[PDB]
Every structure is written in structure tokens, then in C-alpha cells.
Design a protein around this nucleic acid. Structure first.
Ligand SMILES: [K+]
Ligand SMILES: [K+]
Ligand SMILES: [K+]
Ligand SMILES: [K+]
Ligand SMILES: [K+]
Ligand SMILES: [K+]
Ligand SMILES: [K+]
Ligand SMILES: [K+]
Ligand SMILES: [K+]
Ligand SMILES: [K+]
Ligand SMILES: [K+]
Ligand SMILES: [K+]
Ligand SMILES: [K+]
Ligand SMILES: [K+]
Ligand SMILES: [K+]
Ligand SMILES: [Mg+2]
Ligand SMILES: [Mg+2]
Ligand SMILES: [Mg+2]
Ligand SMILES: [Mg+2]
Ligand SMILES: [Mg+2]
Ligand SMILES: [Mg+2]
Ligand SMILES: [Mg+2]
Ligand SMILES: [Mg+2]
Ligand SMILES: [Mg+2]
Ligand SMILES: [Mg+2]
Ligand SMILES: [Mg+2]
Ligand SMILES: [Mg+2]
Ligand SMILES: [Mg+2]
Ligand SMILES: [Mg+2]
Ligand SMILES: [Mg+2]
Ligand SMILES: [Mg+2]
Ligand SMILES: [Mg+2]
Ligand SMILES: [Mg+2]
Ligand SMILES: [Mg+2]
Ligand SMILES: [Mg+2]
Ligand SMILES: [Mg+2]
Ligand SMILES: [Mg+2]
Ligand SMILES: [Mg+2]
Ligand SMILES: [Mg+2]
Ligand SMILES: [Mg+2]
Ligand SMILES: [Mg+2]
Ligand SMILES: [Mg+2]
Ligand SMILES: [Mg+2]
Ligand SMILES: [Mg+2]
Ligand SMILES: [Mg+2]
Ligand SMILES: [Mg+2]
Ligand SMILES: [Mg+2]
Ligand SMILES: [Mg+2]
Ligand SMILES: [Mg+2]
Ligand SMILES: [Mg+2]
Ligand SMILES: [Mg+2]
Ligand SMILES: [Mg+2]
Ligand SMILES: [Mg+2]
Ligand SMILES: [Mg+2]
Ligand SMILES: [Mg+2]
Ligand SMILES: [Mg+2]
Ligand SMILES: [Mg+2]
Ligand SMILES: [Mg+2]
Ligand SMILES: [Mg+2]
Ligand SMILES: [Mg+2]
Ligand SMILES: [Mg+2]
Ligand SMILES: [Mg+2]
Ligand SMILES: [Mg+2]
Lengths: 261, 184, 184
RNA sequence: AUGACUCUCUUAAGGUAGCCAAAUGCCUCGUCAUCUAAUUAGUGACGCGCAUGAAUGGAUUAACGAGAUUCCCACUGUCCC
RNA sequence: UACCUGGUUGAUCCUGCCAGUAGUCAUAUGCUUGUCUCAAAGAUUAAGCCAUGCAUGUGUAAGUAUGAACAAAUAGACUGUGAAACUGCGAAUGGCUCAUUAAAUCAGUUAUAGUUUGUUUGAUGGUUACUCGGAUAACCGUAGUAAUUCUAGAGCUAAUACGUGCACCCCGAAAGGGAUGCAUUUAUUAGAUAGCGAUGAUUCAUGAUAACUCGACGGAUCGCACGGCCGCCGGCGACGCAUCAUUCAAAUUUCUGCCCUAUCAACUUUCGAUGGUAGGAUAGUGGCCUACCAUGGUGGUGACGGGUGACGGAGAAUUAGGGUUCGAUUCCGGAGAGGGAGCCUGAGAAACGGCUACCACAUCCAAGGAAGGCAGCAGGCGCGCAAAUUACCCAAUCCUGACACGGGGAGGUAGUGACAAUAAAUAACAAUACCGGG
RNA sequence: GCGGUAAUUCCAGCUCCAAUAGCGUAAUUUAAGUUGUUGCAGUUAAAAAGCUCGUAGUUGGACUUUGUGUUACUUUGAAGAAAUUAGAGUGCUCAAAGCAAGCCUACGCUCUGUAUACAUUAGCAUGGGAUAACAUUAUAGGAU
RNA sequence: UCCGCCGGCACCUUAUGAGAAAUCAAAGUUUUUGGGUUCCGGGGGGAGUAUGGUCGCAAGGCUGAAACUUAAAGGAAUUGAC
RNA sequence: CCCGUCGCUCCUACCGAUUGAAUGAUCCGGUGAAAUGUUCGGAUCGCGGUCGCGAGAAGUCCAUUGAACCUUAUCAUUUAGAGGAAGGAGAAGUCGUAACAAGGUUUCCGUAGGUGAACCUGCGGAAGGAUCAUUG
């Protein structure tokens, strides 16, 4: 190509969007923004495919152009705005507020939030370095830059960000023993306790996570996101709570449901 | 690009390797006439379906009985056979799947059950009734003789409400005859 | 035009590379600046990839040169090119390129030296000048060329890229190395 | 059409291997092909060869030639004049 | 379905092939064809040539209205709507095709501490000015030419167009002076230890200092709302400039892997072949290029060369297992736009529904010139064994613009369609006559 | 192979057979253990070089704990496009498919579902050390 | 002369073996298929021919096709006829 | 049953004088468009005090990239050719009888010479022989 691609073929879209293959030749091309195109959920999908408020591509534009949708406390009018992990979506007219969290099967879930809990979000620190004039600053994995951070904050830590004051309220150091969630790969959406950190010079760092039921799984450091200090996460989790059940166990529940339901 | 190009489709039968085997011709014709099939294609697709089911069972049996895939897919296969009446609750093992035959599948056809439930005088009579919109499985009218009935649906086979045989008005042959008689 | 691609080159084994695409704009080159010493300063603005700017100096006469030992930098006139390690033909053409040895006017540095050390090569002012004279050391070779009013200097910038001819005054063993090359 | 084959007269022996309208073929500017707009020339083939032929040496042959010959390119007052 | 059968003899047992058997999202062709669903379709030979039409334009309360424009009103700059035109942005995506290309493309896997990146998102930008200047379009009116979004001259007038412009250290009779935003270029210096950040690893992030540059930088812009203090102060937005990070990406790049051929065994190196030093060029690494120097580099573990009716892969057919064959085509990557080459604009192109030249074809002409690129959609010619309508629509999918609204032969809908695939009619029943069995 | 005056084989009628809205004819897979790694042959059927040497290649006896030398191999894991393939759920009337739907009858609910496996080789990371390759050893430049 | 051991050229009997059989003490230990390694065959002809290369004084050697043609050719054994 | 020459027809391929022909590609060389950079040039326009300042077209100079055309050369593919000559096919041609029996001279292999033709002969070898056999 001679430049930037502006189209996304439907079969080339991320699988976790769950788009029907015969629905059309194209899928919403995520706009540039805080989250990567492969790790986001465009507002058009959220409003039309997840919440059913809009029935067509056109109706999504009408909803957004009325300034009825807010992401991280700010109104967004871009249909393909890349809403991602931990983002807070608020719809004042419906009095609804959701947080984008992965379900245990690795797909974004619109977790309904209370009004009190919708005033903050968690961000993962990418790096900390000195800026112009020797002023230290840190940048996160959601595109945010914070100046004059706490000196104790380091890379891979998690910071609690207040969407009103736009300031770091509290932070969690990345260390063994904290509860973390997997944000990418095969184990995406699983929650467990960080048990070990295996460092390999010049290579990716591997982290071993043990589930609450004793199941142990590994992953890369880049796919980990600390949720709380100790064993209690600082955010509300969905019903599964990051517990991945085997297909046999899942089938067992389905069989029981039919008998009762 | 055309979106229709992504629609999937596949084949449902294979022709015999030996076209003029006298023994095979005799056996196939007996099944065709017994169950009132249209042609050898209907029998061949049932054999094709049966081969797929047996092939799946053989692969599972070759695995260790403690293999999670053996346990999960094995139960699903047994459940599927039970829901169509092919197997019995006392035959809950993959080995009994390998013992299935073509007759078992042909006995679950809507055409066979219509005849064997007393609704039709002959197997060929049931064929005409089904295609003529006189039969329903529950609330839905079914006009396909190859419809494979489930155990939970076998007891709901009855004449359609719109049919003359199920409370509907008489067909056009009787109505015209009644009109002719009235004119006299 | 000028290209920096490897397609026209032979493989490491020596075999030829058959062309499989045309030249790309993102792998182009441009004509050399061939900056010369002349009082008619001329620097042309060049638009480069990304909308950025490069300054191509065709003729220069003054430069910003730094006396490393004294930690003083002054603007001075470029007088002559005396040595070039890449091609001696660039010396007689008076071409300004990085790492070329040139002679610069010594007048700007003499004024600072007199103003700083009070020496040629107000009660509180004399107090500090004598204090700084205690730790004053001047290389004999460096001082010998102050009489002629010219200092050997090395160009540290790229006139064809930044449009400027900056450098540093030669001293130490580096000065000895180059002055030996000029001793003929 | 031709004559492997047969018959017949006959020699000291009946020209073998090769080669050819050859500096050797009368007929003859032989026939076919090629070279040319046009060729009694040249070359390659064909051979019942007036009258080819094996140290009276036969058939070839790189290199060589003030040796005979044909063609092509360059070149030109040889010619148009 | 882990299968075979005919053929050598007078007959026999073998070797061995021929023939038969079955499939192909496999093409063509023959004959035949009622219904439902689904659906490929000028790739193969010619990346051959193309009439005609269409496929890219774009307007918000928020850059610029004096249409001699409309509508509604009635001494005011304008302030209802708005054609045209300037300005801005886009047209580098998509679509099409498979010609060239055999460690090349490409695949998995790396690196950028070797670079650029409009936009999005986050953060960050020092202690005449109550607002500058000159042009130009639309418009207006003299035109030229056979002729083209071919073209000349005159009269007017705008800006978020264009050009301008308020906007610690050193010297030192401690006064005074110089430098003093950000960026640019060079040099010196700090960046510890085990006040003082990061990496497996950087004289790295970043700080201070001496200067340097003739620096498209540091708002002469717009909408809405009106308030609070006694002229002052002040809200919510739009657009724009610069820096870092981020996102969208590219470029180059590590390791391994590709069909046949040795009747291809040596190849490369004057004119770069392999490497070194110093430069030049580039967004940046690099013989990418120049000067100089060294004599290296590859190869039966197949270099080099040749063949391919060779784009690569995801995959497709057939498959007990192993395997064989195929992969032009809707997803990803690359490449091209009749053949080459060159280039402007731009964040991004060596662009072709952009330009320049040559060559090959070819259109118009009043013969002085002028205009050309369907391997986009449809259609035509040609080629062939071989492939459809010069249809409708932006309603769905999504893309793009100043933009909720415009546009989209992308895409969808219908037409043609026995490529291929699915379901499924062409009779059922009873009584007689006739014919069997128990 | 049939046809040379009594044609089951040609041209026809009749009857019968196969498939059936399909069927016939004109590169490639299967059959082919007739390309053989699994897995073929070479006395006489096609096929041991006339004989020996010989480099690369390929292949190499036994032995070391039983009761920071470098690799291959094996185990587990991480990463790894979708579509396709396998496969879970689901009565598009069945089916090829599709990714839907289901539940009750309110201003709705099931956080509805849209699993999972496979994915050579090379690369990355743990456990195992039998088998196997290379390297190494006595003037120990040894260990302590 | 007698007994035995190692090595060699062979022969005789035999099948528990192998093979299409002739026959083989290896041509055995092979669908119950795998000790190591080299060369080499893929129906019969065209053909060890054409062409290129290479070796040789030459004679020729080594390397080595295709077009096209054909339903058999061939091995072992049996009964006849000769 | 069966071998070869010769004679007749057809098919495929080979050799072949013609410095054969055509087509395509590549190398070197010659010439060289256009563009870009550079040099010179200063039509013309604007701005200051009839001299300055700034911008700047045509054209020109050198260099770079480099299409295109034209030689020789090499390679590739296709193809004509008098004549020479190979193989195969074509119910029922001519001349012999070489191979099969001890095939009437046992056959065959290598090599050499000769003859209308199969073939013959010399030398060495093999049994695939017509002999598994003379301690006579
Ligand atoms: K690109
Ligand atoms: K002479
Ligand atoms: K643009
Ligand atoms: K790759
Ligand atoms: K490859
Ligand atoms: K570079
Ligand atoms: K170098
Ligand atoms: K742009
Ligand atoms: K639309
Ligand atoms: K729009
Ligand atoms: K086997
Ligand atoms: K012995
Ligand atoms: K004889
Ligand atoms: K004999
Ligand atoms: K003789
Ligand atoms: Mg594209
Ligand atoms: Mg790294
Ligand atoms: Mg003679
Ligand atoms: Mg003669
Ligand atoms: Mg003559
Ligand atoms: Mg003459
Ligand atoms: Mg002659
Ligand atoms: Mg004589
Ligand atoms: Mg004599
Ligand atoms: Mg004589
Ligand atoms: Mg002679
Ligand atoms: Mg001679
Ligand atoms: Mg002489
Ligand atoms: Mg098989
Ligand atoms: Mg017979
Ligand atoms: Mg066959
Ligand atoms: Mg415009
Ligand atoms: Mg090649
Ligand atoms: Mg490579
Ligand atoms: Mg630094
Ligand atoms: Mg360098
Ligand atoms: Mg050089
Ligand atoms: Mg291919
Ligand atoms: Mg090709
Ligand atoms: Mg492909
Ligand atoms: Mg092709
Ligand atoms: Mg196509
Ligand atoms: Mg593509
Ligand atoms: Mg292109
Ligand atoms: Mg074309
Ligand atoms: Mg182009
Ligand atoms: Mg076009
Ligand atoms: Mg285009
Ligand atoms: Mg067709
Ligand atoms: Mg009919
Ligand atoms: Mg008859
Ligand atoms: Mg027959
Ligand atoms: Mg074979
Ligand atoms: Mg065999
Ligand atoms: Mg023999
Ligand atoms: Mg043999
Ligand atoms: Mg061993
Ligand atoms: Mg014996
Ligand atoms: Mg074997
Ligand atoms: Mg053969
Ligand atoms: Mg005889
Ligand atoms: Mg005799
Ligand atoms: Mg004899």
C-alpha cells in the first residue's frame, strides 16, 4: 500500500467482537485512540450489537451526535472510538454506567456499575521517565500521561485514577501475592494471585498465576493487570470472577439448568 | 468481494465404488421398497450420515477413557443418539454406537413413524400424506419425509389443523363434487 | 533518481538479483551539497520526508568553533581547508565537510584570552584575573600558531545536512597527528 | 519407375574403398538447390563417369601462399561525366 | 470400506504393463430439465486492443457573501436561507489483476539502543495592539481560437488565503550592561555510591554551561450565551501552531523453511565483488554512494546458471496410516496499471480514473494544433474448448468530506446462470376381474 | 473382441438393466506395495559397477549410582489471524446452512449464547537425563 | 594311522525355512515387514540410437535422450506334436 | 515357427550447402529526450532613497538520474532446405534360409576383417550345451 488502510474486512476483525460472517463485507475500523485496535470495543459495537439501543449503523451516529454517551467522563461522538479495558461508559439518559471487563471466555463484558463506583478507573503504568525541564512523568497503557507522579510508582504498577479530579488517588506495586487479571492471550479474562515472576535477560518475563481453585496458568508480563493489593480487587468483577470452568464442568451446569429451568 | 461467497455448503452422499454388484443391488432395493424411498440417493445419504457417526465414535474409543476430550465428546454423542431414539438408556457406551445400522436411522424417519403409528395405511401412503401438508410435528407442519423425529416429539405427531383429516375443510375435489351435487 | 536500495547490488554469493519492483520514493537519495568556502553565503531549504526541513549549505564563510580546553565557543571566520582524510581533491577545491581540517581566524579567541587571563598571545577585576592566572597553562604548539592569527580546527558538523560549519580547535595529540601530515 | 535376384557371352583381372560436369564430362550454358531484379560464373548436391580412382598414389587436411576462383562489407574519378 | 476385475497359454503358476472401477469448491461439451434453498461466473489462449456512460468528491450554530439570488420584514456594518467562488480536507483507502519475481516474494519468529508517522487520545507551551499591509476569485465586460474544466487584457471586493507585526551564567565603574521562551548546530560538563530516575545492556532519559541559526514556532481566527463588578472582569465551545508520550502505520531487519535441472562446476571482483577507515546521501542502519586501503565472499550440506503453461501463504482435492496433486480468484502479504524512466504535490505516492519524456498503439482537426490509457463497473472487438445486464439503489455492511444531512459501479438488490451444493413431485387408496402364498 | 447369408456385440422394433432431474463424452487423486520412509525389486522375469583403493557422506563394540562443556531427544507451558477442518449448543418445517435463540406474557427476563480441540518445521521458557552426537583427559595451567 | 581346533575351495542328505517355480544350508532368520552401507531396475520397442560434453592417434570408451510405435514381450513349469 | 537386404506407400525424428531466415532477451559501445541540482543570465514586478533593496521567467553552463534509438556480439525459441540417411506402420511382394530339433557347421559374449542379404571367418571367453560321470 501507499499509505494507511481505512477499511477492515469483516473476517479480519477481532474474533472477540463476535460479528456474524455474513452480516457484511466490512467491520467497523477502530479509530486511533487510547487502546489498540485489536484490544478495544468500538462504540458502534457496544451501542448496536451489545446493548441493542441502535438497530443500524445510522442509528448509532444519531445517539452519539446527541452527546448522550460518555467514555471516561468525557462525551465521545466518534462511532469507532476505541473503548478498552477498564474504560467507564456512562449514558446519563438511561442512568446506566458500565465498565469494560473481559469475561472468563476472553470477550469484553459490559459490567453494570453503581454511581459511586463509576467515578474512577484502573490504569497500568507503562514507564516512568523525566520529561522536558527534568519534570518526571509516567504514561499508562490507556494513552494517559500524568506529570509529577509519586516517586514510588514504577513500571507495570497499577494506579487508581479519579475521572473527576483526573489525579492518581492510589497505586498498587507489581509484586507476588497480589490479585491480577489476564488481559491478553489464551488465558484472557482469568483472575488469580500472582505466585511467581521468572525473568529472562533479553527476553519476555513470565509470570505464574494461581486461580482461587488451585488452577495454575502462566502468561507474559505484558498481559497482566493488577486489580488489588493482597487478594481483594479494587473493582467489581463479573459473576464468573475470573474462574475458568472446563467444558465438562460448563456442560454439567447447562444440564442442571434445563432440569430446574 | 461478495458476502455470499462465504456461505458454506457440502455433500450429503457418496456413490458406491462398485456400481454393478448384484448382492448390493438386491439389498439396497429391499430397503428402498420397504421404506418407500424415492431412489438410491436417499439410502446413500443415510449411509453417509451413519458413517460419520461411527467414525467419530471410533476416534474417541481409540483414546484413553480418562482423556477429557473422550469424556466430553463421548457424552455429547451418546446424548445426541438418545434424543433421536437410536440408542437406549441401557446402551450408554460408545461401543453400542458402532453397532448402529441403516435400519435404525430409517426407522426414525417421519415417513416410517407416520406409517407405524397407524396414521397411514402403507409406507407409500405416508409419503404422499407428508408431502401433501397433512402431517404436523407438534405445532409445525412438516412436508419433508426425511424429517428425523426426536423421542420427545414422536408423541406429538398428528394431522395438521388445516388438513381435511385434522379438522380443516374438505379439499377441492370434495368441495367441487358437493357443488356439482347441489347444482343438480 | 539516486536510490539507496540494495536491489541493484549483487548477492553475497555473487549472483545477480532480478528486479521485482520499481524504485520507491522512501529509499531515494539527493545530490551532494559540495559546500565551499566563500563570502557569498547560500543555504537552500530542503523539504524532506515527514514535512521536516534540511538545510543544504552551498557556500559558507563563518562557523561556530569551540576551544575545548578553555571551554569557550566563539563565532569565527573560516580561512582555508588544509587537510581532508577522505579525498585530497576536496582540499584544493576548498570543500567543507565533516571532519575536514580547516584554519579559522584566531582574533575572537585572543580577545577572550586577554579579557579572561589579562595576557596577550579596576581593583576587584585585577583580583580575579591574577587568581585565574595561577592555573593557566597554554600548549606550546597551540600558542605558536596564535602569532600567525590562524588556528587549526576540525569541522564537527555536517554542512550539507544542517547548513552550518561548526567545529573545535585542534589540541593535544590530535593536533600533533595532523600537523605532522602537513609538514612537507 | 528401378533391378536386390536369375540367365547368357567372356577376361591375366573385369575399377574395389573413395571421388566427380573437378585444373579430369564430349554431349553441355548437363539436372536440382543456393547466391542475383536478371548469372554460360561461384557453391552444395545428383552420376552407366566421351575418357575418375588408389605411392603412375586415392580421399581428407589445421597452418602457410607477390599461386587460380566466387561472394559480402568498407572504400573510392573504374564508371555516370 | 485398509477391496480389486478383464487381457500373453492348448492348459498352468509368475513378472509386468494395458483396460476397466470411484472421486475432484474441475474445466469444457453433448442430450435432457417441473418445484424450493444456496451459489461460482473473460483466471487458463491475449498484463491483447477498446466506442459509450458511470466508478470522488466534500458545508457545520462555529474560515470568507453586497449574486445586480430567494424569503420574510422595515435608517440600519453584518447577524433568515444561500448558488457561485476562495480557503481547508480527501482523492496514497477501496476495487482490479497475477506480468515480472526461486532465500526473492512469503510464512512463523525477531530487532529498531537504526528511523519517519496527517489524524485520535493524554499531557505540556516563558517574567496599530481597542487589531497591520498588499493582492486575487466569484462577480463585472473587451476578447482570441476549428477546438478542450484551451487561453489573454481591464474594472471591483473578502479571509483561519498570502505577507508582516505588539506578542541561573558572563562582563563589570556591587550600580550598569550582555545573554536570558521553544527549536536548531557544535563543544565542555554532570548523569554518584551501594539531592541523584530507567534498561539484560547505552557517555541513555534529563540537567547545567559557552556560543550558533539570517528559525513557515510562541493565536492580528470563529460560534453561542449573557452575567458579575464600577470602563473593569468573566462562561461554555469551534478551528489552528509547537513539543513529548500514545494510537493508526510504514521502512529496514534476525533465525529457519521453496518445485525441476550437473547434457549448469566453479562463480563474484577494472565499472563494488567481501571487509576496513574517513566522508557524502537518506527519515534513519548499510558499498546505499565517493576517496583510499586490504584480498576477500559463495560453492557436491549443489554456489553460479538454466526451466517453470512459478505471485507466496491461510488453504483445496483425495486420503486406514504415511502420502500424491493443486493453490489465477473474495482473508493476509507482495507486485503492476500498454512498455521503460523521471517527477511534483503531500503526513503518506516514485501515484498513473496526477504530471513530464521516450517508445509502442490510437482519437479529433477548419491540418496551425489538441487530447489519449477499462488488469474499476457494465459493454464491444479479438483470442479461444472456455466465462453473464452497456439494469436499480445507497435501505443493509462500512468508508470518506467542512460534514447527524453530501458521495460511494466499494457494497447491496434484481436480471442471465444445469459451475457446484441442499431438500423434494411426476401419484395414493378402495372395490371388481385376473394371478399366487399361508 | 463382433461382422465373411441362420450376428446374444452392427442398423432397427420389442423387452429388460443401471442411475434418475439428472446422465454421457473429452487434467489430476484413488486403485499403485507399478516410486515402496512406513513398504517394492536386482541367480534365471527389467536390474550388482570387471576388480580393488579412496575423500566427502552415511553408519560405528563394551564400560562410569546401584540397592557452570556444548547439543539432539522427551515432558509441560507461553505465544501464536479470521475463514476453512474437527467439534459443543441451537427443530432455519427437514437439509446444505446460519449464528442464532429460549423463557414466560411484562413495559420484561435468562449477567442469554456466539464453547473447545487441532495447528509440521524453526524460535521462546520449565522438568527429565535413558538413548545418541560433538568436545575434553597425564610434564594437570587440576581440585581444595 | 586315530581324535580335535581354527581358516579355505567345494560336495552330499534334509525342510523346521524360502521361492513363480527351477532351485537355494542361503537365494533362510520378511505383511509377525527396520543390523550397516554402496551401486542399480520401473511393460515391449525406438536405443545404448540422436544430440552436447569428455577421454582416445584411430578403432571406440564413458555420459545419454525424444518424437514415434506397440498389448503384449518375458520367467518357470505342464501336456501334446515334432 | 522364423531373420535381413532389395522393391512400393505413408507417418515421426535425425544429418544437411544455404556466411539459412524470423522472433525475443541480454552485454558492451555510440548517440541521447525529459527531469533534477549547479553556473550564468535578468524579460518583468514590487518596495525605499534616479541610485539602491527583494523576488524572479525564457535561455544558458556543468553534473546526475536516465528513457529511447542504432551497431557488433552472445544466448533462447521457432522454422525453410536440394540431397543423404534412421525407425516404425501398412492381410495375402522379390531373394535366399540365419535362429528355434545336434535346426542339419552347437548357440552366445567381446573384438577385428569380409560378403546381395540374412550372415561368414580369426583370437580369447561363457553354458544360457547336445557332457553334472573314468580312483581309468
Ligand atoms: K508499502
Ligand atoms: K606464391
Ligand atoms: K490528500
Ligand atoms: K516473516
Ligand atoms: K517460501
Ligand atoms: K543510511
Ligand atoms: K565502509
Ligand atoms: K495531506
Ligand atoms: K449505504
Ligand atoms: K456520512
Ligand atoms: K504397511
Ligand atoms: K575343514
Ligand atoms: K550359424
Ligand atoms: K543351439
Ligand atoms: K569367411
Ligand atoms: Mg489497495
Ligand atoms: Mg527487548
Ligand atoms: Mg565404384
Ligand atoms: Mg563426373
Ligand atoms: Mg553455373
Ligand atoms: Mg559476378
Ligand atoms: Mg560442383
Ligand atoms: Mg584411367
Ligand atoms: Mg596398387
Ligand atoms: Mg590417373
Ligand atoms: Mg581431394
Ligand atoms: Mg586447407
Ligand atoms: Mg614462399
Ligand atoms: Mg492404499
Ligand atoms: Mg487364447
Ligand atoms: Mg488407468
Ligand atoms: Mg476548492
Ligand atoms: Mg530460476
Ligand atoms: Mg532468509
Ligand atoms: Mg544525553
Ligand atoms: Mg559510514
Ligand atoms: Mg571506490
Ligand atoms: Mg505455485
Ligand atoms: Mg507468471
Ligand atoms: Mg493464490
Ligand atoms: Mg498465469
Ligand atoms: Mg476475477
Ligand atoms: Mg489481495
Ligand atoms: Mg503502484
Ligand atoms: Mg491492456
Ligand atoms: Mg507511474
Ligand atoms: Mg482506469
Ligand atoms: Mg488507482
Ligand atoms: Mg462455463
Ligand atoms: Mg413430466
Ligand atoms: Mg437377426
Ligand atoms: Mg457390449
Ligand atoms: Mg508402472
Ligand atoms: Mg515391481
Ligand atoms: Mg535373457
Ligand atoms: Mg535379466
Ligand atoms: Mg555404543
Ligand atoms: Mg540340497
Ligand atoms: Mg521389507
Ligand atoms: Mg521400460
Ligand atoms: Mg538354418
Ligand atoms: Mg547347411
Ligand atoms: Mg547352425
Amino acid at each position: 500500500a501507499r499509505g494507511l488502510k481505512k477499511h477492515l474486512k469483516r473476517l479480519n476483525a477481532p474474533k472477540h467482537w463476535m460479528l456474524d460472517k455474513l452480516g457484511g463485507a466490512f467491520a467497523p475500523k477502530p479509530s486511533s485512540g487510547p487502546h489498540k485496535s485489536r484490544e478495544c470495543l468500538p462504540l458502534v459495537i457496544i451501542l448496536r450489537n451489545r446493548l441493542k439501543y441502535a438497530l443500524t449503523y445510522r442509528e448509532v451516529i444519531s445517539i452519539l451526535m446527541q452527546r448522550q454517551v460518555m467514555v471516561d467522563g468525557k462525551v465521545r461522538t466518534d462511532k469507532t472510538y476505541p473503548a478498552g479495558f477498564m474504560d467507564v461508559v456512562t449514558i446519563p439518559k438511561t442512568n446506566e454506567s458500565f465498565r469494560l471487563l473481559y469475561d472468563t471466555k476472553g470477550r469484553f463484558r459490559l459490567h453494570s456499575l453503581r454511581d459511586e463506583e463509576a467515578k474512577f478507573k484502573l490504569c497500568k503504568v507503562r514507564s516512568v521517565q523525566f520529561g522536558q525541564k527534568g519534570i518526571p512523568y509516567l504514561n499508562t497503557y490507556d494513552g494517559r500521561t500524568i506529570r509529577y507522579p509519586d516517586p514510588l510508582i514504577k513500571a507495570n504498577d497499577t494506579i487508581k485514577l479519579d475521572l473527576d479530579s483526573n489525579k492518581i488517588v492510589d497505586f498498587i506495586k507489581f509484586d507476588v501475592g497480589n490479585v491480577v487479571m489476564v488481559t491478553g492471550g489464551r488465558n484472557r479474562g482469568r483472575v488469580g494471585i500472582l505466585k511467581n515472576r521468572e525473568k529472562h535477560k533479553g527476553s519476555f518475563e513470565t509470570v505464574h498465576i494461581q486461580d482461587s481453585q488451585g488452577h495454575e496458568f502462566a502468561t507474559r508480563l505484558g498481559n497482566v493487570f493488577t486489580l488489588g493489593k493482597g487478594s481483594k480487587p479494587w473493582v467489581s468483577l463479573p459473576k464468573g470472577k475470573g474462574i475458568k470452568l472446563s467444558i465438562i464442568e460448563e456442560a454439567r451446569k447447562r444440564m442442571a439448568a434445563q432440569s430446574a429451568t | 468481494v461478495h458476502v455470499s461467497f462465504y456461505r458454506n455448503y457440502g455433500k450429503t452422499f457418496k456413490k458406491p465404488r462398485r456400481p454393478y454388484e448384484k448382492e448390493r443391488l438386491d439389498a439396497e432395493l429391499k430397503l428402498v421398497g420397504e421404506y418407500g424411498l424415492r431412489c438410491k440417493r436417499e439410502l446413500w445419504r443415510v449411509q453417509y450420515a451413519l458413517s460419520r457417526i461411527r467414525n467419530a465414535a471410533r476416534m474417541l474409543l481409540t483414546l484413553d477413557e480418562k482423556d477429557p476430550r473422550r469424556i466430553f465428546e463421548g457424552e455429547a454423542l451418546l446424548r445426541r443418539m438418545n434424543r433421536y431414539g437410536l440408542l437406549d438408556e441401557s446402551q450408554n457406551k460408545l461401543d453400542y454406537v458402532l453397532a448402529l445400522t441403516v435400519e435404525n436411522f430409517l426407522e426414525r424417519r417421519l415417513q416410517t413413524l407416520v406409517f407405524k403409528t397407524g396414521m397411514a395405511k402403507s409406507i407409500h401412503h405416508a409419503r404422499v400424506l407428508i408431502r401433501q401438508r397433512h402431517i404436523r410435528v407438534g405445532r409445525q407442519v412438516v412436508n419433508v419425509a426425511s424429517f428425523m423425529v426426536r423421542v420427545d416429539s414422536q408423541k406429538h405427531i398428528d394431522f395438521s389443523l388445516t388438513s381435511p383429516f385434522g379438522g380443516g375443510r374438505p379439499g377441492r375435489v370434495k368441495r367441487k363434487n358437493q357443488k356439482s351435487a347441489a347444482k343438480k | 533518481g539516486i536510490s539507496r536500495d540494495s536491489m541493484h547490488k549483487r548477492r553475497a554469493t555473487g549472483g545477480k538479483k532480478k528486479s521485482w519492483r520499481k524504485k520507491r520514493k522512501y529509499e531515494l537519495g539527493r545530490q551532494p551539497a559540495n559546500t565551499k568556502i566563500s563570502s557569498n553565503k547560500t543555504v537552500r531549504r530542503i523539504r524532506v520526508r515527514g514535512g521536516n526541513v534540511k538545510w543544504r549549505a552551498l557556500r559558507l564563510d563563518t562557523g561556530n568553533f569551540s576551544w575545548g580546553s578553555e571551554a569557550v565557543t566563539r563565532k569565527t571566520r573560516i580561512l582555508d581547508v588544509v587537510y581532508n582524510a577522505s579525498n585530497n581533491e576536496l582540499v584544493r577545491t576548498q570543500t567543507l565537510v565533516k571532519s575536514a581540517i580547516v584554519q579559522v581566524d584566531a582574533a575572537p579567541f585572543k580577545q577572550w584570552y586577554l579579557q579572561h587571563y589579562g595576557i596577550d598571545i579596576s581593583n576587584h577585576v585585577v583580583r580575579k584575573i591574577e587568581n585565574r592566572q595561577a592555573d593557566r597553562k597554554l600548549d606550546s604548539h597551540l600558542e605558536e600558531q596564535f602569532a600567525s592569527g590562524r588556528l587549526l580546527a576540525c569541522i564537527s558538523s555536517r554542512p550539507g545536512q544542517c547548513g552550518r560549519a561548526d567545529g573545535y580547535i585542534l589540541e593535544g595529540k590530535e593536533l600533533e597527528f595532523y600537523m605532522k601530515k602537513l609538514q612537507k
